[PDB]
Design a protein around this ligand. Sequence first.
Ligand code: C84
Length: 491
Amino acid sequence: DRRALRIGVNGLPPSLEPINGISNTGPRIINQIFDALIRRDYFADGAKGNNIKLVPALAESFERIDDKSIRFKLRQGVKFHNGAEMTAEDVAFTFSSERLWGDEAIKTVPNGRNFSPNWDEPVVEDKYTVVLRTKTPSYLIEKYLGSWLGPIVPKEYYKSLGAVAFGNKPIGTGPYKFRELVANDHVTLEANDGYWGDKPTASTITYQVVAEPATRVAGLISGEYDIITTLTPDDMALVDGYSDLETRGTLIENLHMFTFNMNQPIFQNKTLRRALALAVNRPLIVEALWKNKASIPNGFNFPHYGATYDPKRKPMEFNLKEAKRLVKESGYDGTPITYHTMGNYYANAVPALMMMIEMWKAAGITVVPKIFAPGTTPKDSDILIRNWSNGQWLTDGLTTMVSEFGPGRGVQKRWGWKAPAEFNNLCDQVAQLKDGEERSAAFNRLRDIFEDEAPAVLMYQPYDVYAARKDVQWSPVSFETMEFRGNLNFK
Ligand SMILES: CC(C)[C@H](O)[C@@H](O)C(=O)NP(=O)(O)O[C@@H]1C[C@H](O)[C@H](n2cnc3c(NP(=O)(O)O[C@@H]4[C@@H](O)[C@H](O)[C@@H](CO)O[C@H]4O)ncnc32)O1
């Protein structure tokens, strides 16, 4: 009786395990399978899918005890998709040393510690009461638990499988349950009619990989999909000529960027990294490819950071003359530098690259495109420049400056960035510091080092564009996810 929803996607995540699936492609599936203790109510008070309001979800209520602990009273009678009841034991397990942040845990959940605050072990007080806490003060615990770090996993089932196998056969409490997957092809979910919240409106949801955006557009037109993802503003004219189809877009809390393998000699030092940054004329790219709908941040700095947004910070400059001076200072010898991109996995990746190649040529640098196919993982040692994105996943400036670029984390450890000591000291400091003038100035000091060092170059916040049949009522949200709770009606 309920319609089956068909979504043509840019790709599938490497896992459906909540943390290992953090990516542009995972939340749209993981949000359906799981619930967290707290949900972001994107559409509260008439907001156009960008409200930050956090409301109770698997937690019926909660109260902060002190600067490092929160007591959660859980909703009773919630079931996981395998029939097991959700209790404090599952919530404690979700945020335990064993699963998330301990030495052994991070062998199978590699960013469990990197992305977490300084957790202490959860304390189970009764079947429906758990205290979540940090070893040191943290004013962000609530925000973490309402984020993509927050999905609650089933303790016994997850332990029986381990994180890798669980990521191929996930069980949660959410409105849709996992049915099947074929790697790099599709994921099918089915309605969980035993859902504790509003009943699911779709009988099944299928996420089908269609890597090429032109093919994905053609598939919505030809009636193969109900919704398609990862389009650009210029794709609106291909869709909108048809009366029964439309585009739906919004600025999302994500940053497109490019970054460097700083283990490679040409990028061991900051000079050429910063020259490449200064040579990009972002306004021109945004005009040409984005209809002026993408937003160029004034540093690693967004309005949804709230108290750590600095509206007075100056934008990063486009300065060709200075880029040229830094190319000469760097001793650049004319070697062609590759830029790897997995096609248009990121919207406008290839057109933006081709515009940037011309800007880099104007600075005296030869950059060559290396477009690779889905499922052809380039070796780290073969990467010079690559594109990437970072979801700005708390309403706080700590992410992703600290969570990606901080001490011991991926950019420094895997990709070789030799950050100044003071950068790493500031990263550690801001995690214990309450919002206020001092925290805002510390983030500006981090941003200054980040700009000087250029371990990555921020391009813009994309204007995310989906296309859909008008007979499917669904609004996008300002994040790299799809929300169907209270937001998916057919006809
Ligand atoms: C599991 C392994 C055993 C296996 O060998 C293989 O899967 C593998 O090679 N894994 P490896 O780690 O080497 O990941 C490879 C190496 C390379 O960095 C690439 N990559 C990483 N992030 C990706 C990205 N993120 P995204 O832009 O969609 O999502 C970002 C996310 O990366 C980021 O953490 C988050 C918060 O900043 O924001 C998201 O938007 N989008 C497309 N490609 C991505 O895949």
